[PDB]
From Swiss-Prot, chain B:
Attaches the virion to the cell membrane by interacting with host receptor, initiating the infection. The major receptor is host ACE2. When S2/S2' has been cleaved, binding to the receptor triggers direct fusion at the cell membrane. When S2/S2' has not been cleaved, binding to the receptor results in internalization of the virus by endocytosis using host TFRC and GRM2 and leading to fusion of the virion membrane with the host endosomal membrane. Alternatively, may use NRP1/NRP2 and integrin as entry receptors. Binds to host ACE2. RBD also interacts with the N-linked glycan on 'Asn-90' of ACE2. Cleavage of S generates a polybasic C-terminal sequence on S1 that binds to host Neuropilin-1 (NRP1) and Neuropilin-2 (NRP2) receptors. Interacts with host integrin alpha-5/beta-1 (ITGA5:ITGB1) and with ACE2 in complex with integrin alpha-5/beta-1 (ITGA5:ITGB1). May interact via cytoplasmic c-terminus with M protein. May interact (via N-terminus) with host bilirubin and biliverdin, thereby preventing antibody binding to the SARS-CoV-2 spike NTD via an allosteric mechanism. It comes from Severe acute respiratory syndrome coronavirus 2. Residues 9-11 are annotated as: Integrin-binding motif. This is Spike protein S1.
Length: 49, 48
Protein backbone atom coordinates (compact mmCIF):
# COMPACT_ATOMS: atom_id res chain seq x y z
CA UNK A 1 0.00 0.00 0.00
CA UNK A 2 2.83 2.33 0.98
CA UNK A 3 4.09 2.22 -2.61
CA UNK A 4 1.00 1.40 -4.66
CA UNK A 5 -2.61 2.33 -5.43
CA UNK A 6 -5.56 0.19 -4.36
CA UNK A 7 -6.61 -1.05 -7.83
CA UNK A 8 -3.23 -2.77 -8.16
CA UNK A 9 -2.67 -3.50 -4.47
CA UNK A 10 -5.75 -5.73 -4.29
CA UNK A 11 -4.20 -7.95 -6.97
CA UNK A 12 -0.82 -8.18 -5.22
CA UNK A 13 -2.35 -8.94 -1.84
CA UNK A 14 -4.68 -11.50 -3.37
CA UNK A 15 -1.65 -13.39 -4.73
CA UNK A 16 0.00 -13.50 -1.32
CA UNK A 17 -3.26 -14.58 0.33
CA UNK A 18 -3.64 -17.47 -2.11
CA UNK A 19 -0.06 -18.57 -1.52
CA UNK A 20 -0.29 -18.50 2.26
CA UNK A 21 -3.73 -20.08 2.20
CA UNK A 22 -2.21 -22.96 0.25
CA UNK A 23 0.39 -23.23 3.03
CA UNK A 24 -2.33 -23.77 5.61
CA UNK A 25 -4.04 -26.41 3.48
CA UNK A 26 -0.78 -28.31 3.17
CA UNK A 27 -0.17 -28.07 6.91
CA UNK A 28 -3.61 -29.27 7.99
CA UNK A 29 -3.74 -32.13 5.48
CA UNK A 30 -0.47 -33.52 6.77
CA UNK A 31 -1.56 -33.26 10.40
CA UNK A 32 -4.62 -35.38 9.64
CA UNK A 33 -2.57 -38.02 7.84
CA UNK A 34 0.03 -38.08 10.62
CA UNK A 35 -2.59 -38.13 13.38
CA UNK A 36 -4.03 -41.33 11.92
CA UNK A 37 -0.62 -42.98 12.36
CA UNK A 38 -0.24 -42.01 16.02
CA UNK A 39 -3.82 -43.09 16.57
CA UNK A 40 -3.02 -46.52 15.14
CA UNK A 41 -0.06 -46.64 17.52
CA UNK A 42 -2.19 -45.64 20.49
CA UNK A 43 -4.60 -48.45 19.57
CA UNK A 44 -1.74 -50.96 19.57
CA UNK A 45 -0.46 -49.64 22.90
CA UNK A 46 -3.94 -49.84 24.44
CA UNK A 47 -4.34 -53.40 23.15
CA UNK A 48 -1.00 -54.44 24.62
CA UNK A 49 -1.90 -52.74 27.89
CA UNK B 1 -28.81 4.00 -13.23
CA UNK B 2 -26.84 7.14 -12.36
CA UNK B 3 -25.99 9.50 -15.21
CA UNK B 4 -23.19 11.88 -14.24
CA UNK B 5 -22.12 14.52 -16.71
CA UNK B 6 -19.50 17.25 -17.07
CA UNK B 7 -16.86 18.75 -19.38
CA UNK B 8 -13.11 18.12 -19.06
CA UNK B 9 -10.03 19.04 -21.05
CA UNK B 10 -8.69 17.06 -23.98
CA UNK B 11 -5.73 15.29 -22.37
CA UNK B 12 -7.74 14.44 -19.25
CA UNK B 13 -10.05 11.69 -20.56
CA UNK B 14 -7.63 8.97 -19.44
CA UNK B 15 -8.04 10.13 -15.83
CA UNK B 16 -11.74 9.25 -15.76
CA UNK B 17 -11.18 5.65 -14.70
CA UNK B 18 -11.37 3.48 -11.57
CA UNK B 19 -8.23 3.75 -9.47
CA UNK B 20 -6.25 6.70 -10.81
CA UNK B 21 -4.37 9.69 -9.44
CA UNK B 22 -4.23 13.14 -10.96
CA UNK B 23 -5.25 16.75 -10.49
CA UNK B 24 -8.83 15.96 -11.56
CA UNK B 25 -9.20 12.56 -9.88
CA UNK B 26 -7.89 13.68 -6.49
CA UNK B 27 -10.79 15.82 -5.26
CA UNK B 28 -13.13 16.51 -8.12
CA UNK B 29 -14.46 13.15 -9.34
CA UNK B 30 -13.14 9.93 -7.80
CA UNK B 31 -14.40 6.81 -9.54
CA UNK B 32 -14.40 3.80 -7.18
CA UNK B 33 -13.04 0.36 -7.97
CA UNK B 34 -16.55 -1.17 -7.68
CA UNK B 35 -17.35 0.49 -10.99
CA UNK B 36 -19.90 -1.34 -13.11
CA UNK B 37 -20.84 1.63 -15.29
CA UNK B 38 -19.55 2.88 -18.62
CA UNK B 39 -17.63 6.06 -19.42
CA UNK B 40 -18.62 7.75 -22.67
CA UNK B 41 -16.54 10.73 -23.70
CA UNK B 42 -16.64 12.56 -26.99
CA UNK B 43 -15.14 15.64 -28.56
CA UNK B 44 -17.18 18.78 -28.02
CA UNK B 45 -15.91 21.58 -30.23
CA UNK B 46 -17.86 24.58 -31.52
CA UNK B 47 -20.78 24.01 -29.16
CA UNK B 48 -18.74 24.63 -26.01
Amino acid sequence: LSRLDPPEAEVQIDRLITGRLQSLQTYVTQQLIRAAEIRASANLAATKM
Amino acid sequence: VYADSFVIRGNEVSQIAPGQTGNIADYNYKLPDDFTGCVIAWNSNKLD
